[PDB]
Structures are given as structure tokens and as C-alpha cells.
Amino acid sequence: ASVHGTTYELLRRQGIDTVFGNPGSNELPFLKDFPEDFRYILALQEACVVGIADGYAQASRKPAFINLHSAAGTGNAMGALSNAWNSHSPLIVTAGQQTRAMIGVEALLTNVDAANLPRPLVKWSYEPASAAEVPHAMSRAIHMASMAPQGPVYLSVPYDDWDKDADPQSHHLFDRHVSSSVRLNDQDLDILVKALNSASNPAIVLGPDVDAANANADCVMLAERLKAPVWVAPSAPRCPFPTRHPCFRGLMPAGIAAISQLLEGHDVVLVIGAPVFRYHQYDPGQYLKPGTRLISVTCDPLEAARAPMGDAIVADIGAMASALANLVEESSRQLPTAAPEPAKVDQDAGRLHPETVFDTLNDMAPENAIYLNESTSTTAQMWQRLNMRNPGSYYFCAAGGLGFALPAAIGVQLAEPERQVIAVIGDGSANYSISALWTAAQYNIPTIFVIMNNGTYGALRWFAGVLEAENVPGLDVPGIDFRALAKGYGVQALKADNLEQLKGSLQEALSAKGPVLIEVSTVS
Amino acid sequence: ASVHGTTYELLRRQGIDTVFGNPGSNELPFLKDFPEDFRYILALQEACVVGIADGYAQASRKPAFINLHSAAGTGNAMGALSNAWNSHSPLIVTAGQQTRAMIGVEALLTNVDAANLPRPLVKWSYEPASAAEVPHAMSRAIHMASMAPQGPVYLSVPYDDWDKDADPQSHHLFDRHVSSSVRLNDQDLDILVKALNSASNPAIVLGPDVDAANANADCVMLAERLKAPVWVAPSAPRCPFPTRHPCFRGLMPAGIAAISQLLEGHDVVLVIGAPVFRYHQYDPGQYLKPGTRLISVTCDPLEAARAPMGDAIVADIGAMASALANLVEESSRQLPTAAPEPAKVDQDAGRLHPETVFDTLNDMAPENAIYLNESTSTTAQMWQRLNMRNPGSYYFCAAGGLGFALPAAIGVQLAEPERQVIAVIGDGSANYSISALWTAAQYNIPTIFVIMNNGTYGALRWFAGVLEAENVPGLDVPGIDFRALAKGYGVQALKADNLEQLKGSLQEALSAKGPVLIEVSTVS
Amino acid sequence: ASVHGTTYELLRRQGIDTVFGNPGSNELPFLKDFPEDFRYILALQEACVVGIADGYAQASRKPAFINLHSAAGTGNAMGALSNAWNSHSPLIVTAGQQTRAMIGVEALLTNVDAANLPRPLVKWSYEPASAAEVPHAMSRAIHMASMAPQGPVYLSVPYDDWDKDADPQSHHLFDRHVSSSVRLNDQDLDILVKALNSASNPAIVLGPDVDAANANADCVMLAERLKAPVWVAPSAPRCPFPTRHPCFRGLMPAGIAAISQLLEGHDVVLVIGAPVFRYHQYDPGQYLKPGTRLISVTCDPLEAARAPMGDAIVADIGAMASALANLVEESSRQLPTAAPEPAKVDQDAGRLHPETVFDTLNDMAPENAIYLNESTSTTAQMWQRLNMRNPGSYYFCAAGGLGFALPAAIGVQLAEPERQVIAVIGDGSANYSISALWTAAQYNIPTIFVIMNNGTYGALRWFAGVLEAENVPGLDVPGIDFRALAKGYGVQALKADNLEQLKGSLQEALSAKGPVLIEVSTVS
Ligand SMILES: Cc1ncc(C[n+]2csc(CCOP(=O)(O)OP(=O)(O)O)c2C)c(N)n1
Ligand SMILES: Cc1ncc(C[n+]2csc(CCOP(=O)(O)OP(=O)(O)O)c2C)c(N)n1
Ligand SMILES: Cc1ncc(C[n+]2csc(CCOP(=O)(O)OP(=O)(O)O)c2C)c(N)n1
Ligand SMILES: [Ca+2]
Ligand SMILES: [Ca+2]
Ligand SMILES: [Ca+2]
Ligand SMILES: [Ca+2]
Ligand SMILES: [Ca+2]
Ligand SMILES: [Ca+2]
Ligand SMILES: [Ca+2]
Ligand SMILES: [Ca+2]
Ligand SMILES: [Ca+2]
Ligand SMILES: [Mg+2]
Ligand SMILES: [Mg+2]
């Protein structure tokens, strides 16, 4: 067998059947004789390739396989890798290298010092020392991406390796099963359970690894048993809990003082599947108020190590959430009361308040819709106004890096064909990965893109006001016609200049069989 | 509180009370006002510092704290870090940096790009961005070293940081408990147990992480229940099993073909706490013969990912070994028969055969002795001839890097004052870290050093013969007087030119109250 | 031709005929069939290997070739590389790697992520992607080490590559000549010369790259023409000027305020072949006083970039010094007056003051002696008391990293067999690379080692006093018998407890035909 044949068998045997890519010359020998049972999803720029793959992996809860061109292609994707690192996305990033005979002279297309290029944004990065090692290196990549804490990995392959003979002993790679589905030993788990049962006013904080693990339902049972309020950890990349469940308390503000105040009076705070904490704004104060003990369950040693407070347990979130949900006592305390309905913001017949947009989406979208957020000034309102009952219903750039949501919404839609995906994206954010739209058109992936157009980088204008910063350049982005951009990449385009048009446009988008972009005129 | 005071409180609160070090100017502000409840162990070169700390950590089964001088001191220790990485040794390596005001100009003693210096031999490497971050960075270092898979970490601290005010919120660091004591979820554990119970001819292979976890006794119960032979995984850094237990089958040869042949006929091979496998010699062939399934339990994702065959589970070795030992059925098969006694090699009244040395050590040493091996051509015979009943009884440079055993034997002896440590070290190996002897003298740490002196790099001569390599320079090391070197560093010195003198010397060494070096004239 | 044959031809053709090494298994296939016209110099630990090679390269003013064993051997040498980086030493560091077929599984002796190991202490670091690339990679290593600014490089080679067929086109590598012998263009050079000619009170500061370039005599002519005082830049690794020339003003103190004060009143300060500046102690103040302009000529962009003041020119020091010396006008100012003779410190019949030692060395040593300094508390006195008329007469660990001088003195002596080398080394420093003594004995390299024994890390005690630091552990090193250590490695040993014995011992050492160590009892 060739290295090419053995590697594709490995991938198939390990459950991979889709390649997200932008091709180049170093990759043609890998991509040739492309197996009939595999799918290739082309995107026009590598941030888009990786974004699409990322959404696909996150939604599918399985690794996604990527093929990029050498250093320039990998480099174009590195902002996308920043997000993937923070979301623990299992991405197998492969890139082609020059033929081994031309690496030394640094011929054009040579990826110099290749394994260092994507660092520090990958779990593992490697270029094999021989062609026969490639299948083994690919196996390592698959498992490194897939083991807890999941994350992106990188493999560079000289293009002449593919046609070489594989090692017959590579067959032992095909069916390897590697598990990290582990939980705290029984003795120490019993101690934890007793601490939760004995708490007088527990609280629960959930992060993205709960949704990644599909531990949402177990966390609901845990919160109902403990009669505890539930918050989503700050800067949330995913939604880990039904947002109209009586226990839900919403998104935590991303500040030290604000979180310790929220937790005041709670004697035990159990954090699951989140860093402690992904703060953002400067908000100095106490990490915890006196009287609060924090206990973190994380899939990631790096999270456990950097938490400035609390005990931690490093384990699989699915295994731990299931165990905890089934072991804790049913408290006789009263179940928390559901959050009140959000207020309706006054809306005239002119430009749309973002609150209006979210309320209308929540009114019209199916109950199993999936939302993506890259409307950076409106996140708090979005979290308050969308009823997200199901797992896998929300994604936000986990490193704050713009250019995620537009391609990721395509990948999510590919992963979940029966769930309408709706990406809510600011006019600023929409540009970073605008060319991703083409992939939705070409493959007829019926994502809905809602562009919130207020002509400015609104979150930056706001922060400049907080800083009392004057004379800041580059905050406005006037003069972008998003309907024309949609037409440019073959996506049906609609406008909404007022509420009546928003409703009409959303009705048309929801029934459409292809992707749709709606340009919404929002308040400045 | 100062950064100095807060950091030492953190260390004390986290169980650290000993600093292994070689001082320098960037470190004086850390070392001043040294707490009265801490111990400083000086060594004369940094390979020795780290070696001593490594032995201490491995034997104590807890982190060891190190302080080195900037780049040159760290660099002198990097061979020692190569071994520590492979043995999963929890070492907290700190190094002082220039004052922040002098870093830019690269004043003498500036550690340039400091965090990159020890890579790739550390789990985590960091220089804090401010003085008030130092306690938090130290906390990260402690936990990163201590979480599974354990390993060395590195922290560089500008010397002016120590006197600065600490953040009062650093108090939340002091009592953090971080656990990775996890095991496979119940459903999948039951599947594994059923596979072991249903095996017709199981075998067990154990590596160093069993001894590190003190899982030895649980593995004995597991092997007795399964009626299975037990091997030690190749290139063994530690001894995970009683070497005269009826199930013990010794050290596996470090070759692909040799191991698959040994495992032939065994339908299930359970590997615990080892890489799959730390091969050494070129010995191409099948990774496994038809009919053998391999299952690996490892504490290290990197091990699980690179295994070329078998299923893997990433979990704590102590937790998994205890669970497996208590869940498997008692097989009705006959218990394996103990290995026969080793042959007595003919010995005249002249230079000593290594077999003779090991037999005599085994005859005279206490049953709870601890051995270290850095006699590279005699390892197989050592493993056959020493009855090691207890955990923590054997150490060998885990990366094959010479210069470990002499300092590590001092650290092991410090960790286990009631257990006589005996380091068996070749004349070649003894030089790498010879100055470590001084620490044993100064602190009166009564390690016994047995120098196997045959005048040559014997393992290299042997391999040159295997390669049929002629005209290889640098293989002989004549003209070293080890008694004179011992006197140089204040260690009592004895000679053994024949068996009678070996017995006499060992009797004197075993009764001595200080360290002793015995120079043994072994066969060329 | 094999890769082995082609590589050794390349080395020979490029002027390399000596391998400094400590062997291992990954290196035997390189070292076998060792050419009859090459020399192998064995040392017992890799800090010693590299130190010896470094001294050889610095003194010979040509690259030195090193062969180390994989990661552990390379790691043991990294403190030595810290010094080599700072001294711009052209060192070609090669290390053997596992056979390509065993790299993936990380067999014992695999150097993982090899090219990252010695970073950031090398100019270039690389592992070739195929066997046929090895000669080309070796060529790159040779030239990268040798081009200005010179420095260490690293090459890792899988051991199976050596026996493979080489590319016949590798013959184009053999006779490549690569020059960096460049100087400032004529127009800008004329501007510089006019600035020097028009200065009313110029000063000159010289660093180690002057001695490396053998630009010493040109700098003498330059200083005589400009009638300018000459200082050696701080933390001096080499001596760039005759120390009894009337213009010489000695070693600059390594402090910001102290240097700007020394330069006050000098309208133009020309720095050649030094960083601006290798400060050490904290001595805040002005980089330059008003009225002083600084101009730096450096071979190193990194030096030019980080200088906090002055203009800079990046060029070859030899070419620039020769051009400047021959272009500047002869000033009619009076030649500076020679520094006065140093004072004779009172000396009783007891332990030796370091001043006494240096005065006696200067009285008895040949005029073409070469000195090395690793007596860290006595450097200022050494620089005042030794008349060093010739180039290549002084070496001091360029990064301050101890363990340089003892092995480097052996390498210097090998490079300069007609020049008596005298290494003056503190009792603390002597231990770091003590095993290097064996190489001097085995090869009969007649270096003289003068051990200044005061029982303590005196420079650290002094600095602790400056800091007013109490309770600093680890500052004393009692109980080392250096005569016994010398005997241990086969080096003739002498003692000097008083001045009469010092003179007697030095007379015997100077006439000896082998290496000699003198243990001198110096004042505490
Ligand atoms: C790749 C990248 N570049 C720059 C930023 C900085 N960024 C933070 S929010 C913001 C404005 C985004 O504007 P828009 O999408 O229109 O949303 P709005 O803030 O107006 O709601 C920008 C540019 C970023 N996070 N990522
Ligand atoms: C730091 C380091 N340098 C070099 C080697 C290569 N090495 C492998 S075994 C060997 C010989 C050791 O000789 P000795 O300790 O006398 O034992 P013997 O082989 O004679 O039993 C050497 C140098 C190594 N493993 N580590
Ligand atoms: C590898 C290394 N480790 C530690 C130091 C810190 N160091 C600075 S000077 C000094 C003392 C050296 O003592 P000695 O050689 O006896 O000379 P003295 O200071 O007594 O003159 C030490 C350990 C260093 N520079 N390099
Ligand atoms: Ca509504
Ligand atoms: Ca799907
Ligand atoms: Ca906007
Ligand atoms: Ca016996
Ligand atoms: Ca103990
Ligand atoms: Ca030997
Ligand atoms: Ca005199
Ligand atoms: Ca010469
Ligand atoms: Ca001293
Ligand atoms: Mg990078
Ligand atoms: Mg490094």
C-alpha cells in the first residue's frame, strides 16, 4: 500500500470522511485519487476553511480534518486557530510541504521550521522524518486532537511522501481506541458529593466544555437536585444550559469584582467545564468574597493550574457531570424561580434596536434553531432574549477573534442539516471572513446570515468611552453594501430597514432552500 | 506582604520545604531571609542540583523545588531535565532573571527569551509580566508539575520582583487542591474488566508510573487474580513489581521484534504506566503477532497518542490499578511459576565479573535497599540478580542520559533515610556529575556509590561490535582514580580489586555513617 | 559516495580536522571509519566538550566542530552554549538522532523536537528531512557559524543517514567561500573619519570582537593617531588591547552611571566590537552625560538594535578597524600618559591575597602567556596586574556562566601550543567542569590551573553585603581537596599555602611538560 492509501484508510477507520481545504501544489499529491467516500469542502481563504471546520467539529462533537497550503495557507488560518484553541476544538490541521529533496535549498513553497509556525495555538505540531512515518504521525494527530482537553493539532507532510510505500505494520493504527472518559475516584468523588449535599446555598457555573460533552441534560438534573442557580461562565463560547430553565441566571459579566459579588452568599460554587474565569474587562477586586468556596471541574490541566482560587478536578466533563447528577441528594430547598421576561424596548418605524432583532428572531425561529454571535456590542441582550432549549444552540468566537461566526455557521449547518442556523454578525465582523459565503452557495448549505449594520465598530466605541479615550482612529466602517457582497458570492440577499421589513425578510429566509443574507439597519 | 513572603507561604502551604540549588546573583533576593523552616541543599553544578532534586521527588512521590542561576545555570541542568521529562518527575525549576530595568539592554546575567530555553523538556515554561503575578505563576508551576502526567516546569523571575508588594488576593492560592486522581468511567471500566476476565492467556507489562503511583501492590493483586506473567516495560526507569514474585518475568528487551515474540500467544496484554514502548535497539519486525490484543493504561496523552498499536486509556495509574485489582475475577488458572535462580558465573581471584558484584550486593544489602543503575553494559544482569521486594527500589536514567544516578542517589537517600541507597555506576558514567559527591559529604547523606571500573565505555564498545564499526574513537577512559576523586569531595573511599576485597568493602560501607565510594575493578 | 564520506570531505575542504566529542550510540555511525587525518578530542561531560571546543575556536579564530549525544548530551552542554553565544564563538554543534524509523515512537535516545532544544542559544538549528540533505545541512551549519556575527549552530542527524548514498551534486559544497569581510561604504566612512578627526577629546572603547578579529594592532594605531584613551568594554570576555600601552585605561565598571561618568568630557566615544553595554550591577543613571556622542561599530545587528544610545554601524570588525586605523589623521594632541603601576598589597607569610597571586604570575609567566579568568571576586585586580602585550591573551566566561575556564584553557592550550596557558579559577568555579582535567592529562595538553581557594562563593558573599541581604544559604563550599581531584584525573598537583610556596609551585608548573594544578590558599 502507498502512504496515501494507508492514510486515507486510517482516516476512514477513525471516523473521518470530510476534508475542509484550500488546495495548493504541495497538497495535490495528497488530494489526488481522492476517495469516493470522502467529501471535500472548499473555501476561498484559510481562515474560512478553518472556521467552517471548527463549526463542524464543535457541532458534531468529533474531530474535523483540514488541509491547507504550506506556510502561507497555515498562516492565513492562525487567527482561526486562536479561537479553536480556546474552544477546545478537535481540529486536525494538515499542511503540505515541499518535496524532501527541495526543503534544504528553501525552494518556493517550503514551510520553514514548519512545526513552530502554529505554536503556541496547537496541542501538538510535527513534521515526520520519513514517508513511512506519515500514517503513524497522522494517528498521533487524530488522537492528540481528540483526547481531553481537545484542541487543534498540526501535521506538515512533504508532498513526495504520499506515493511512497507504507509500512505494512501501519495496519495496527487503524482501529486504535483511545479514551480519556475519566472521572474522579470513588473516595474523593464521595467527598465532593457530600460537600455539595451539605451546602446551604450552592451555585453552579457552566462553561463551553459542558456543551461540547453534551453534558447539558446532566447539569440540568444536577441543578434541579441541588436547587441551585446556574450561570454561564463569562465570555461564553457555547451555551451549556436551557436559557428558560427556572435555575438559569444568564451570562456572567466578565469581571473579577462583578463575579465575586454575584457569588456572594453562595457557600459552595461548583464550576464545570470552564476556565476560572475568562474575565475580559478590567474590574479589580476580590476573586471571591468571604464565605464562598469554589470547586472547579475542568477537562484541561492548564485551566486548573491558572485558576487564582478554588479546588480543581481535572477530568472528562461528560463523565463527571453524569456521575454528579446521579449521586447528589435531592435537596428539600425550593427550586429557584425563573428569570423574568426581558423588557420590550420601544421601537419606532425606523432603524432597528438590537433588542428588537433578537426578540423577533426568538419569535420566528424554530425551537431547535442554532445561533452564532459575532455582534460584539449586543451579546448581553442576545443572551437575555433567545430561548435556547437544546444543546448545541450557541457559538461565539472563543478567543474573541472576529472572523469565526460567518464560516463557522456554515460548518454548524453542515453538521446539523435539520436545525436552522442563524448567524448574527456585526457589519464590522462580517468582513473578516466574508469569502466564506461562497462555500454556503456552492454546497447549498442553508445558513441564514443576519448582518447587524450600524456603520461602526460599536464595541470599540463603547470601550473608548469607558476609557475616556479621545481621538481614536479607525472605529468607523461606513460604505459597505452587504447585499452586493452576498450577490458577489452567489447568496440570496435581503434588506431590513425597519421592523416590518425584518419580519418579511426573516419569513423569506426561514423558508428558503439556500443560504440567505439579511442586511439589517440597526441603531447607531 | 512582599512577593517573597507570599511566595514562601505558598510553597509551605503546598507542602514544599526544601530548595535544591546552586546560587547566583539574580537569586540572592529570593534566597535572602531564607525561612527557618526550609532546607537549602547546595550542589556544585546544576546537573547535580537537578539530579538530586529528581531522585528526591521520585522517591518522595511529591514535587521537588529547584533554584538555578539564569540561563547558564538552567543550561547546565538541561541534560538532567531530559531524564526528568521521561520519568514524569514533578520538578519545579526556578531561575532568576536580571532586574526588569536591565533586561532590555541584555545586561550580563539576562536570560534571553527565557521561557524558550528549557523547551521542549518542560510541561510549562514562563516568565511573569509583573512582580505581583509571581505568586500566581508559582502556583501554576506547582500544579503543572504535580498534575498527571507529572513533569518538570520552569519559572524565570526578575530579581527585583521579590521585594515588591504582593497582591493580597494571592491568599486564595495557598490552599488550592488540584486533583487528577481519575479513572475510567464505570461503563467502560466494566467492559475492560470483562475483557481481562475472558482472556485465556493474559500478560501484564508495567512501567515506571506504577512505581511513581505506589501502585505496585495493586498490580501484584491484579497479576495474582489474572494468574498472569508480569514484565517490566523496556528501558525501565523504575521497578514496578517484586522481582522474586512468581509472576515476574523481568525486563523486556528494548526491541520491536523481541517484544512481539515475547507476547506471542498472549491474547490480551495489559500495559500499565508505560509508554508503548520505549524501544532502543534497532530490531525491526511486527509490533504484535497475530492473536495478541494490547490495552494500555497511561497517565500521559503523549504516550497514548504515539503507541503504534493497541487501545489506550488516559488516567491516573494509582486509581486505575486499584480499581482493576479490586474488580477482576479470581481466575482458576494456575499461578505462574517463579523464574529460576540466576546462574553463578565462574569467578577467579582477579577482577570482578559484574554478575559477581550484583550477586554479592544481593547477598549483603538489606532487604529494603534502594538501587540506582548507571552501569550501562550490565543492566540485564542487574535486573536478574537483585531481589527488590519493595516499591521505590530501583532508578535508571529515564532518557538514557548519564549523570543521573550519582546525584539522584543522594536525593533518594535524603528522601528515604531509613533505606540504604546503593548506586551502581560505571567508570564512564561516574564523571558526568562527579561533583555531586560533595553534597553527600557536606550534608552527611550516607549513600553508597559502587563504581564499576573497567576502563571503557563498554556499552558503546558492544554496540560498535554489533554495527561492525571499526575505527571508532573516544571509547576508552583510562586513568581515573575514583578513590582520589572521592577524597577530593570528602567522601570515604574504598577499593575492591577482587571478591574478598569487595565483601570487605561492602561490609565497611554498609556500617558507615557517612557516604562511601567503592571503586571495583571489573572485567574488561 | 556515502553521506559519511561526503560529509567528512566537506569538513576537510572547509578546514575542519578536529572533532570535540563525547560519544553515544546515535553517533557511532558518524564516528566509525574516523578519517586518519582527523583528530578526536574526548571529554568526559558535554559542558567540558563544548568548553574545550570554545577555547579552541576563540584562540584559533576559526570554527570548532563538536559531536554530542542526542538530547541529554546536548542538554548537558547548554550552559556552555550560553557563554559561546555571548562570545560569538563559531561552534558547529552536531548531535546524533535515533534512526528515522524509530523517531515516531520516541524510542530511547530520540531527541524530541530537536531543533528547539538549544534555542535560543544558537544562530541556526536544524534536523534534515532526508539523508541526502545532510551534507548540505552541514554546509549551512559551517557557514552560519562562521559568518559575522559568529556564533554556535546546531545540527541533529538521524544515525541511519550516514551510510546512505550522497547526492553527487554535493560536490559543489566543498569549496564554497562565504565572506562577510565588509566595511562601511566610502561616503559614510569618510563622514565617520571626519567626525573622529574633528573630535576635541575622543575616547575609544573596545570589546571582545576586536580580539576575535585580531584587530588589536589596528586599534593600537587608531588610538595612537587619535591620541585617545582606550577602555575595555565591561564584562570583558577577551582582551582587545595591550594592557601597558600608554593609552590603556583598563576595564570599565559594568554600570550605567559609572560608565557615563567615565566618558564625561569626551565629546566622541568610539565603541568597537562590543555591545553597548554589557552592564551587570544595578547602577542607575544617565547612559551618557551631556556633551558625549557615542558611535558603535559592531559585527552584530542584535547589538546595534539594543544599544540605548548612539549611532551604530554593523560591519566586520577587522575590516572596519583596519580602514579606520589607516584613514584617520595623526592628531597633534599629546599621547595619553600610561597608567601608573599598581600598588603592592601588604602580604604576610600566611594565606595569599589575590593581588599577590596576580603580581607573582605577572613576574614569572612568559610574556606570551595566555590567561583565563574564572575567579569572580578578583577580576578587577587581575585586569590591573597582568601585562598582556599580545592578542589572544585573556578569556572570561562571556555570559558569566561558570564552568568555562577550566575546559576552555585546555582548548586554548591545544590551539596555541607555544603559548603557556594559565587558568586562574576560584574554588567554587573549579567544580562546574572539573572532569575536563582528564582531557588535559590524556592528551598531555600542558595547561596550568591555578585554583584560588578561599572556601566560599566570594563574589556572592560580596553582593549579599551590597544588598544588605541576611540569611542567604549556600554561599560556602568548604571541604574540597583540589590536589586529590587533580590526582583523580591524572594531573600533577601542587599546593601553595604562602608566597614562598606559590613561587616554588609556579616555577615547577612553568617547567612541567604536562598539565599542572596548583591549589593556592587565598584570603577569606
Ligand atoms: C481579528 C480581530 N480583529 C480585531 C478585533 C477587535 N474587535 C473587538 S469588537 C470589534 C468591533 C466589531 O464590530 P461589529 O462586528 O460591527 O459589532 P459591534 O461592536 O458594532 O456590535 C473589533 C474590531 C478582534 N476582536 N478580532
Ligand atoms: C550525557 C550522555 N552522554 C553520552 C552518552 C552515551 N553513553 C551510552 S552508554 C555510555 C558508556 C557508559 O560507560 P560506563 O558508565 O563506564 O558503563 P559501561 O557501558 O562500561 O557498563 C555512554 C557514554 C549518554 N547516554 N549520555
Ligand atoms: C553556572 C553558574 N552557576 C552559578 C553562578 C553564580 N556565581 C556567580 S560568581 C559565583 C561564585 C564563584 O566562586 P569562586 O569561583 O570560588 O570565586 P570567588 O567569587 O570566590 O572569587 C557563583 C556561584 C554562575 N555565574 N554560573
Ligand atoms: Ca416574544
Ligand atoms: Ca451531523
Ligand atoms: Ca457594527
Ligand atoms: Ca546469593
Ligand atoms: Ca521522606
Ligand atoms: Ca565502563
Ligand atoms: Ca612585578
Ligand atoms: Ca594553532
Ligand atoms: Ca572562592
Ligand atoms: Mg508560531
Ligand atoms: Mg530550548
CSV table of C-alpha atoms in Angstrom, one decimal, chain B residues 409-513:
chain,number,residue,atom,x,y,z
B,409,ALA,CA,21.2,8.5,44.7
B,410,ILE,CA,21.9,11.4,47.1
B,411,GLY,CA,18.4,12.7,46.6
B,412,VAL,CA,16.8,9.3,47.1
B,413,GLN,CA,18.9,8.8,50.2
B,414,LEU,CA,17.7,12.2,51.6
B,415,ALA,CA,14.1,11.1,50.8
B,416,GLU,CA,14.4,7.7,52.4
B,417,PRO,CA,16.8,8.0,55.4
B,418,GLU,CA,16.0,4.5,56.7
B,419,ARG,CA,16.6,2.7,53.4
B,420,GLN,CA,20.2,2.1,52.3
B,421,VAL,CA,20.8,3.5,48.9
B,422,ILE,CA,23.4,1.8,46.7
B,423,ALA,CA,24.3,3.4,43.3
B,424,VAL,CA,26.0,1.1,40.8
B,425,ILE,CA,27.7,3.4,38.4
B,426,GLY,CA,30.2,2.7,35.5
B,427,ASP,CA,33.6,4.5,35.5
B,428,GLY,CA,32.4,6.4,32.4
B,429,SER,CA,29.1,7.5,33.9
B,430,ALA,CA,30.6,8.5,37.2
B,431,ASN,CA,32.3,11.5,35.7
B,432,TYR,CA,29.3,13.3,34.3
B,433,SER,CA,28.1,14.5,37.7
B,434,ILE,CA,31.1,13.7,39.8
B,435,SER,CA,30.9,16.9,41.9
B,436,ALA,CA,27.6,15.7,43.4
B,437,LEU,CA,29.6,13.6,45.8
B,438,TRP,CA,30.4,16.8,47.7
B,439,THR,CA,26.7,17.3,48.6
B,440,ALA,CA,26.6,13.8,50.2
B,441,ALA,CA,29.7,14.7,52.3
B,442,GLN,CA,28.5,18.1,53.4
B,443,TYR,CA,25.0,17.0,54.4
B,444,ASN,CA,26.2,13.6,55.6
B,445,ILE,CA,23.8,11.7,53.3
B,446,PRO,CA,25.0,8.1,53.6
B,447,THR,CA,24.7,6.9,50.0
B,448,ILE,CA,27.0,4.1,48.9
B,449,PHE,CA,28.5,4.5,45.5
B,450,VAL,CA,29.8,1.4,43.7
B,451,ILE,CA,32.0,2.4,40.8
B,452,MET,CA,32.2,-0.4,38.2
B,453,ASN,CA,35.7,0.4,36.7
B,454,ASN,CA,36.6,-1.4,33.5
B,455,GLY,CA,38.4,1.5,31.8
B,456,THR,CA,36.0,1.8,28.9
B,457,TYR,CA,32.6,2.9,27.6
B,458,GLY,CA,31.6,-0.8,27.5
B,459,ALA,CA,28.1,-0.4,26.2
B,460,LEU,CA,29.5,1.6,23.2
B,461,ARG,CA,32.2,-0.9,22.5
B,462,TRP,CA,29.5,-3.5,22.4
B,463,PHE,CA,27.3,-1.6,20.1
B,464,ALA,CA,30.2,-0.8,17.8
B,465,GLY,CA,30.7,-4.6,17.6
B,466,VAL,CA,27.1,-5.1,16.7
B,467,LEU,CA,27.4,-2.4,14.0
B,468,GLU,CA,30.7,-4.0,12.8
B,469,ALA,CA,32.0,-0.5,13.2
B,470,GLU,CA,35.8,-0.1,13.0
B,471,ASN,CA,38.0,2.8,13.9
B,472,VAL,CA,35.6,4.5,16.4
B,473,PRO,CA,37.4,7.0,18.5
B,474,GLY,CA,36.7,8.0,22.1
B,475,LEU,CA,35.6,4.7,23.6
B,476,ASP,CA,38.2,4.3,26.4
B,477,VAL,CA,38.5,6.3,29.6
B,478,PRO,CA,41.7,5.0,31.3
B,479,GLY,CA,43.5,6.8,34.1
B,480,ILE,CA,40.8,7.8,36.5
B,481,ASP,CA,41.4,7.3,40.2
B,482,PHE,CA,37.9,7.3,41.8
B,483,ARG,CA,39.3,7.0,45.4
B,484,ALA,CA,41.2,10.2,44.8
B,485,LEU,CA,38.0,11.9,43.4
B,486,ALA,CA,36.1,10.7,46.5
B,487,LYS,CA,38.8,12.2,48.7
B,488,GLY,CA,38.6,15.4,46.7
B,489,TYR,CA,35.0,15.8,47.7
B,490,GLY,CA,35.3,14.5,51.3
B,491,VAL,CA,33.8,11.0,50.8
B,492,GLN,CA,35.3,7.9,52.4
B,493,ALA,CA,36.9,5.8,49.6
B,494,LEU,CA,37.5,2.0,49.4
B,495,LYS,CA,38.8,-0.3,46.7
B,496,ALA,CA,37.8,-3.8,45.6
B,497,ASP,CA,40.2,-5.5,43.3
B,498,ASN,CA,38.8,-9.0,44.0
B,499,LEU,CA,35.9,-10.7,45.6
B,500,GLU,CA,37.4,-10.8,49.1
B,501,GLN,CA,38.0,-7.1,49.0
B,502,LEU,CA,34.5,-6.4,47.6
B,503,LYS,CA,32.9,-8.2,50.5
B,504,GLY,CA,35.2,-6.4,53.0
B,505,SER,CA,34.5,-3.1,51.4
B,506,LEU,CA,30.8,-3.6,51.3
B,507,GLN,CA,30.7,-4.6,54.9
B,508,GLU,CA,32.5,-1.4,55.9
B,509,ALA,CA,30.3,0.7,53.6
B,510,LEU,CA,27.1,-0.8,54.9
B,511,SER,CA,28.1,0.1,58.5
B,512,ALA,CA,29.4,3.5,57.7
B,513,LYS,CA,27.6,6.6,59.0
